[PDB]
Design a protein around this ligand. Structure first.
Ligand code: HEM
Ligand code: 6AW
Length: 456
């Protein structure tokens, strides 16, 4: 048993059980477990995912060292998670040299120039989202946001990876829609991933059986989807595909891996955050009116948002950020400790997963006044400098942060601008209040957010 380590290092934690470790404590969610631990062990503590020692850390300096300083030398990778197949090459999964190589090649993809070039595209599906919303605002029946936002999010993804101009909501049965939709993942507390942690010694076994967490089903029709366009569309002579093609040491059957992860990364994420935001504005009509006014002051007479226009919206940026404080989609940030180290006084042995509890740190009394309340003013220029960048980490930090940050932000904002210009979102009878979060390992709502939509 490796279960003696935190006792021996003099680190407090909940007492692990044989084989299971502390996993049974997840029955309440990463979220309440991390908050409880913080509350009763203080700044630093230790637990076991099966036989895997995880060290939680909460000190801004120490986090900065793990996330930003010793990233390259010591804390380079995330923890392996289950049988991954060819997706071992995807940037967010890759390790060491291979990761450093991929992050360089793909960095040019997420530049402001490429992003400004992507505006007219993502924006054009703002109009579709509106159109679509306009029909359902005439029904007067509760809208399921995550579904309307889902279609928008797919729509924006497809289009910025080799223009696949699909009206995703109203082409429910299109090859690109059906596959992509199914790439809704991953819950690391579901039955499957649970066993993966009580039995990591089973991963080698499933890998050799070709069993993959990214279901073979989906990855198949994308490997093949990509193969023909990549060859045909530029044989006759503005998207991630092109940007990728041009920069060719980037292997063929690694480009597919990047392509899949950008779908898997923006699809469920952009749509979830957006839902959480529209929930927040509905249950906060004041904020929503304040927002609609900012937008109308900047873009008078429903004028179409632009790149520069979007950045100019102080209050929009504040609403987005607050929503991310309350519902960070990562929940935790993790790095594997590559060799023995001494960071800000304390010793980390090689092999330990070092873990920063974002969801918990985002809700900590030491840093936030009335931390349960949705209050966008915390992010106004008056108060924002009191906000520590290593407590508030919705996009991680350091060399291994979210490569898609500015794209995520811009995308989401463009959706909000076009949507708020045209509609108001009011809660109805089916709407859950206060919103309850899911007990799983994906931070999402128990019941899908349903809201009344009214035409301005
Ligand atoms: C609102 C939506 C999003 C949120 C809240 C978000 C947040 C994050 C967070 C917290 C990390 C971990 C960083 C760390 O360990 O410090 C991350 C990693 C990453 N994200 Fe984003 N993300 C979002 C959307 C995107 C989009 C749109 C893309 C690209 C299309 C993207 C691509 C990545 C990649 C490739 C990594 C791993 C980076 C690496 O290992 O080098 N995510 N995301
Ligand atoms: C394939 C899993 C995951 C890899 C990296 C993400 C980044 C947010 N990691 C996570 O934070 C997610 C939680 O939503 N999962 C994890 O926390 N892990 C990968 C670690 C893990 C694996 S098992 C476990 C339990 C047993 C304690 N923890 N997704 C992924 O590929 O990133 C695409 C995205 C980019 N931006 C937002 S999502």
């Amino acid at each position: 048993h490796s279960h003696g380590l935190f006792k021996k290092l003099g680190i407090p934690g909940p007492t692990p059980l044989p084989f299971l470790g502390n996993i049974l404590s997840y029955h309440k969610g990463f979220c309440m477990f991390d908050m409880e631990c913080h509350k009763k062990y203080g700044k630093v503590w230790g637990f076991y995912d099966g036989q895997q020692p995880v060290l939680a850390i909460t000190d801004p300096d120490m986090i900065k060292t793990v996330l930003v300083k010793e990233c390259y030398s010591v804390f380079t990778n995330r923890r392996p998670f289950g049988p991954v197949g060819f997706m071992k090459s995807a940037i967010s999964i890759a390790e060491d040299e291979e990761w450093k190589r991929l992050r360089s090649l793909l960095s040019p993809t997420f530049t402001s120039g490429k992003l400004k070039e992507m505006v007219p595209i993502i924006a054009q599906y703002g109009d579709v989202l509106v159109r679509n919303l306009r029909r359902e605002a005439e029904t007067g029946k509760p809208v399921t946001l995550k579904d309307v936002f889902g279609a928008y999010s797919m729509d924006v993804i497809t289009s910025t990876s080799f223009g696949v101009n699909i009206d995703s909501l109203n082409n429910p049965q299109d090859p690109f829609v059906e596959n992509t939709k199914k790439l809704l993942r991953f819950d690391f507390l579901d039955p499957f991933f649970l066993s993966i942690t009580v039995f990591p010694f089973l991963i080698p076994i499933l890998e050799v059986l070709n069993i993959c967490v990214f279901p073979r089903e989906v990855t198949n029709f994308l490997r093949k989807s990509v193969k023909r366009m990549k060859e045909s569309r530029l044989e006759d002579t503005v998207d991630f595909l092109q940007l990728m093609i041009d920069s060719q040491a980037l292997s063929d059957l690694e480009l597919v891996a990047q392509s899949i992860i950008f779908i898997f990364a923006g699809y469920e994420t952009t749509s979830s955050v957006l839902s959480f935001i529209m929930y927040e504005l509905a249950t906060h009509p004041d904020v929503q009116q304040k927002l609609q006014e900012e937008i109308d002051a900047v873009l008078p007479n429903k004028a179409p948002p632009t790149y520069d226009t979007v950045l100019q919206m102080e209050y929009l940026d504040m609403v987005v950020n607050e929503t991310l404080r309350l519902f960070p989609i990562a929940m935790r940030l993790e790095r594997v400790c590559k060799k023995d180290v001494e960071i800000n006084g304390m010793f980390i042995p090689k092999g330990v997963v070092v873990m920063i509890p974002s969801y918990a740190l985002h809700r900590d009394p030491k840093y936030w006044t009335e931390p349960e309340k949705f209050l966008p003013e915390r992010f106004s220029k008056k108060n924002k400098d009191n906000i520590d960048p290593y407590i508030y980490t919705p996009f991680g930090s350091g060399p291994r942060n979210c490569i898609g940050m500015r794209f995520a932000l811009m995308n989401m904002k463009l959706a909000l601008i076009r949507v708020l210009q045209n509609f108001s979102f009011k809660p109805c009878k089916e709407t859950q209040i206060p919103l309850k979060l899911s007990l799983g390992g994906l931070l999402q709502p128990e019941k899908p957010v349903v809201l009344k939509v009214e035409s301005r």
